[PDB]
Every structure is written in C-alpha cells, then in structure tokens.
Design brief:
Bound molecules: ligand C5N, chloride ion
Helix content: 25-40%
CATH superfamily of the largest domain: Transferase(Phosphotransferase) domain 1
Strand order of the largest sheet: 1-2-3-4-6-5
Radius of gyration: 19 Å
GO molecular function: ATP binding; identical protein binding; kinetochore binding; protein serine kinase activity; protein serine/threonine kinase activity; protein serine/threonine/tyrosine kinase activity; protein tyrosine kinase activity
CATH topology of the largest domain: Transferase(Phosphotransferase), domain 1
Number of domains: 2
Shape: globular
CATH class of the largest domain: Mainly Alpha
Distance between the termini: 49 Å
Subunit structure: Interacts with TPR; the interactions occurs in a microtubule-independent manner. Interacts with MAD1L1 and MAD2L1.
Protein name: Dual specificity protein kinase TTK
Family: Belongs to the protein kinase superfamily. Ser/Thr protein kinase family.
Number of helices: 9
CATH architecture of the largest domain: Orthogonal Bundle
Oligomer: monomer
Organism: Homo sapiens (Human)
Order of helices and strands: EEEEHEEEHHEEHHHHHH
C-alpha cells in the first residue's frame, strides 16, 4: 500500500497488482485526478537488441492502431528508457479468460457480441500486416461489456528468470505445429468460440501433449461439433477449424457470416 510511480511527469497512485508474466507486471492505478488506468511495467534490463526492437515495434503499432478501432485497448501514454517501459493503458473489469472460468454458461447474445468484437480487433491488425499468432482468451480485456485486444503478438516474451494454463497449445493451428498467414488467427479465434459454445477447447481432453499435437494435425481425427440450437454458430465453428488453411474461412468472410449479421 501507498506506492506511487511517475510516467512522463504525471504521478500515479498504485492500488494493486492485477497481473504479471515474463518480466512484466500490471498495476491498477489512479492519476492525480483520480481517473483509473492499468499500468503495464516491462523490465528491460536483461533484453537483447532484438527484444528491445520487438517492444518498440509493438508500442508503435499499438499507438497507431488504437485510432483505427475501439476494439483495441487504449494506450494513453508511455515512458520508455533502457531499464523499463511503463504503459498507461485503459482499465478493464476483468480479462476474458478469467471471466470464462467464472461462468458456467455464457449467454448466446453475450457470446455473439464478444465474437464480433474479436473479429473486428483481429481484422484491424491484419489490415496492417500483423498476424498475432498466439490468440487466447487472456489476450482480450472486458471493458464495460466490450472486448479489447490487449496485444499484437509482436513483442518477444522474455523468461521469468527471477524467484517469482501457461504456454498452452490448445489454440495452436496445424500449420504452426508442422513449422505466416492470417488464417492462423482464424483457427485460434475458432478455438475461443468453440470454448464459449461447448465449454472446452476442441482438443482439451487430450492430456498428453504429444498426442494432442498429433491430433491437431491428423486429418483423420474428426473434431466433434455437437448439434445446438444456433446452426449458424455450428457452421462458423466448422469453417474456422478446417485444418487446411487455404480451405479455412477468412476474417472478411466471418464478418459477413449470418451468425454475425442475421437479427435473431
Ligand atoms: C495477455 C497480454 C500480455 C502479454 C504480455 C505481457 C503481459 C503482462 C503480464 C500481458 N498482459 C497484459 O498486458 C495485461 N494483463 N492484464 C490482467 C491486463 C493487461 C493490460 C491492461 C489491463 C487493464 N485492466 C485489467 N483488469 C483486470 C484483469 C484481470 C483481473 N483479475 C485479477 C486476478 N484474477 C486472478 C484474474 C482476474 C483484474 C483486473 O482488474 C482489477 N487487466 C489488464
Ligand atoms: Cl477510436
């Protein structure tokens, strides 16, 4: 308690830590006017030039792309030095991953609204040549019912190093396993929707990771799509989770899909 920090001359009161990973921490904070933000702190002391560049590149894209869609998290300010980065970001209620863990059933409307938000954010980054390639529910922040994409997958994650469902392959596409395309983000989004529809990711039940990786790529391993009242949702899932990326549906196609367009 009673910690503060400064970012471009502005003093922020730290209320609590709300996340961490790699060599970074996220803080719920207040500025001088008692407006709430999240500050993301990245420790750069161990970073090589390649890693420093990947962080610079991500900050530049995030700062640019927030003006192109409200489904991308706001970045209000940042301070960047050799030792660290402080990013003053939009505050959210909770991330999507934690929310889905709390909820047994998701409301069909809620599920559809979240889907629309994700497609729009991801479509935005693709329009600027960015493939995320590691989309999971944790990459989305819920802000007053609206999803915001938190990151673009450009920054190279540094290792924990210090004393101090992680690195999961459940959202990984076939083409990523056999060793880059916007279709890769479609598979991952499809895995998120699949989770929101049937309460688990398509290959979740396979505990052995080698088996699971083989199941992702094996075209004889049929993915189950049990019947549900929303036949358009069932179709979206089937189209996202085609193993051949060339046969897989595109984001502009998903945006014109009756699941997102037809007023039910
Ligand atoms: C996944 C993206 C990523 C990639 C690399 C490095 C990092 C930093 C750890 C990240 N993570 C973040 O960049 C990040 N993580 N979180 C939690 C936030 C961010 C960015 C900004 C942000 C804004 N508002 C929130 N709110 C929030 C989220 C989760 C929670 N919790 C509390 C602990 N529970 C066990 C789970 C749920 C609480 C929150 O606010 C009170 N939360 C956040
Ligand atoms: Cl905007």
């Amino acid at each position: 308690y009673f910690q503060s920090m400064s970012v471009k001359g502005r003093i922020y009161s730290i209320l609590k830590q709300i996340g961490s990973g790699g060599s970074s921490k996220v803080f719920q904070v207040l500025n001088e006017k008692k407006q709430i933000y999240a500050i993301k702190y990245v420790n750069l002391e161990e970073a090589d030039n390649q890693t420093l560049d990947s962080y610079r590149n991500e900050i530049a894209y995030l700062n640019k792309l927030q003006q192109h869609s409200d489904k991308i998290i706001r970045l209000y300010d940042y301070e960047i030095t050799d030792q660290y980065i402080y990013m003053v970001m939009e505050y959210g209620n909770i991330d999507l991953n934690s929310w889905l863990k709390k909820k047994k059933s998701i409301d069909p409307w809620e599920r559809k609204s979240y889907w629309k938000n994700m497609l729009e954010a991801v479509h935005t980054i693709h329009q600027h040549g960015i493939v995320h390639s590691d989309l999971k529910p944790a990459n989305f922040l819920i802000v007053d019912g609206m999803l915001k994409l938190i990151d673009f997958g450009i920054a190279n994650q540094m290792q924990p190093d210090t004393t101090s469902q992680v690195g999961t392959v459940n959202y990984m596409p076939p083409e990523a396993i056999k060793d880059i395309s916007p279709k890769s983000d479609v598979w991952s989004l499809g895995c998120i929707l699949y989770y929101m529809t049937y309460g688990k990711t398509p290959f979740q039940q396979i505990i052995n990771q080698i088996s699971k990786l083989h199941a992702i790529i094996d075209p004889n391993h049929e993915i189950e799509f049990p019947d549900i009242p929303e036949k358009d949702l069932q179709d979206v899932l089937k189209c996202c989770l085609k193993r051949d990326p060339k046969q897989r549906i595109s984001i502009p196609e998903l945006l014109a899909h009756p699941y997102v367009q037809i007023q039910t």
